[PDB]
């Protein structure tokens, strides 16, 4: 349903946040 | 529905957080 | 309805977090 | 409703996170 | 209700995140 | 109640985020 | 149900954020 689909979109966006945090860690190390 | 729409707005805001984190990564690289 | 409105308030608060992250990036850059 | 009230408490806590992030930006300045 | 109670626990956890971000700000200033 | 249980899992995951932020503060210290 | 499953996906994505923040802590220490 549409509520579950929207919640999956939230989960996808949170994974994008995780990735961006990894890019911060990598950037600091460089 | 309005609940699914509001959840999609939460997903969009989380994407904005990810992009802001990328700006921090880019700042650390400079 | 009140649930959808409250979810929109969460989305707004998340946009505030994105802005504060942009402030961190700017502060690091000088 | 109690669900909408609890969602509002989530939004208030997210604004606290935004403010704490602004404090990190102020620390970086500084 | 149990859903409202769980949502309150999420708000409490978000306040702990704000406090931890305070700790980062204070640690950077030290 | 599976929805309530999953929301409790969200709260637990958020507490893990708070702990990881304390680890960042400890790195600065 | 699918709503509960999507909420569990959100919890998993939050754990990924915690892991990424630990990568930042390790970077700051090094």
Author numbering:
A (entry chain F), B (entry chain G), C (entry chain A), D (entry chain B), E (entry chain C), G (entry chain E): 1 to 30
F (entry chain D): 1 to 29
What does the article say, verbatim?
αHBs are oligomers of 5 or more α-helical peptides that assemble into coiled-coil structures with central solvent-accessible channels. We targeted two properties of αHBs: oligomeric state, which directly affects the internal diameter of the channel; and the identities of channel-facing residues, which fine tune this dimension and introduce different chemistries. The αHBs are loaded with an environment sensitive dye (in this case, 1,6-diphenyl-1,3,5-hexatriene, DPH) that binds within the channels and fluoresces. Accordingly, challenging the array with analytes leads to differential displacement of the dye across the array to give a fluorescent fingerprint.
